Amino acid sequence: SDDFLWFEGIAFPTMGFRSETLRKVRDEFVIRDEDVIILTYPKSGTNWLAEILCLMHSKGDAKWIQSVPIWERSPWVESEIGYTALSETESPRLFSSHLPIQLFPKSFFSSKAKVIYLMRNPRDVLVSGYFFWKNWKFIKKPKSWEEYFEWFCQGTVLYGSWFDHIHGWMPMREEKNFLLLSYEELKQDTGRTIEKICQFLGKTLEPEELNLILKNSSFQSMKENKMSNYSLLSVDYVVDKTQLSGDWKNHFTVAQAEDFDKLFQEKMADLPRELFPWE
Numbered sequence: 001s002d003d004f005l006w007f008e009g010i011a012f013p014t015m016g017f018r019s020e021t022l023r024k025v026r027d028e029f030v031i032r033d034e035d036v037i038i039l040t041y042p043k044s045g046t047n048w049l050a051e052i053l054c055l056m057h058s059k060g061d062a063k064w065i066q067s068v069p070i071w072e073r074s075p076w077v078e079s080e081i082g083y084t085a086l087s088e089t090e091s092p093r094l095f096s097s098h099l100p101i102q103l104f105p106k107s108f109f110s111s112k113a114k115v116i117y118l119m120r121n122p123r124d125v126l127v128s129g130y131f132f133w134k135n136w137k138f139i140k141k142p143k144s145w146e147e148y149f150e151w152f153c154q155g156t157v158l159y160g161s162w163f164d165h166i167h168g169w170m171p172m173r174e175e176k177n178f179l180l181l182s183y184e185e186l187k188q189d190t191g192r193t194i195e196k197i198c199q200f201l202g203k204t205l206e207p208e209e210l211n212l213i214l215k216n217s218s219f220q221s222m223k224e225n226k227m228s229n230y231s232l233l234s235v236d237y238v239v240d241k242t243q244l245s246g247d248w249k250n251h252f253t254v255a256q257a258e259d260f261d262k263l264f265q266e267k268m269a270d271l272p273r274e275l276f277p278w279e
């Protein structure tokens with residue numbers, strides 16, 4: 001039946017989600033000014049950012065971060081457990097969300113809460129997305145990477161158009177409660193970033209703590225996490241236990257990348273070029 005949980009014109013996973021809830025989230029859910037949400041189009045960096053911040057509160061000690069699945073560390077409001085937990089939870093609070101602007105709880109535009117929106121080069125999101133979602137149980141699947149490429153360049157995928165999703169919050173980049181990051185700068189120099197974060201979030205830590213943090217927060221340490229990699233995720237969620245590679249240039253065919261360039265051009269043309277590190 002459909003193969004996707006359609007809500008408000010947007011594809012959602014069947015398992016672990018619920019329309020009533022996606023609504024119990026927009027015209028019902030209550031956001032506090034002392035809340036933290038990592039805003040991300042799926043497969044853009046959430047897990048990392050999540051760990052980083054998680055490290056903040058733990059001030060380096062990766063003990064916690066290690067023995068707790070991220071969905072628990074930073075729940076997804078939109079999701080059942082996410083909502084279920086988030087609500088029966090004490091403040092302050094931190095959570096993730098892939099929701100496009102228009103689906104985000106209205107109670108946020110009133111409050112002053114702090115939201116971080118880590119944006120990532122779409123081409124790499126397309127790839128990572130592909131492999132990941134093709135191994136996700138109970139949802140339409142592309143018969144071919146050429147097909148997934150088609151789906152993505154039209155939005156016809158989970159959580160809608162990445163273009164859309166971006167165009168949606170960019171106009172909100174200037175608020176004092178919205179910090180816009182990007183994959184590039186989170187990798188090409190994890191230092192700055194962490195600064196802007198603790199800064200924007202309004203926090204400081206010992207030097208020997210910012211030390212311990214930096215350690216457990218660089219790519220390696222990250223792409224080596226048995227939590228930030230899901231690991232022990234119900235086999236019902238994934239089609240293959242092992243699947244649990246490469247840069248978008250190792251995946252985009254020359255024509256594709258080409259077509260995809262005329263795409264970003266036309267589509268993003270109404271925005272500041274400076275807005276995208278990646279070429």
Ligand SMILES: C[C@]12CC[C@H](O)C[C@@H]1CC[C@@H]1[C@@H]2CC[C@]2(C)C(=O)CC[C@@H]12
Pocket residue numbers: 013015016042043044046071076079080081082098230233237
């Ligand atoms: C797909 C995803 C949100 C899009 C992410 O960047 C990839 C994440 C994998 C783990 C999923 C999560 C949505 C909510 C789920 C379904 C849960 O509640 C437990 C497993 C969770």
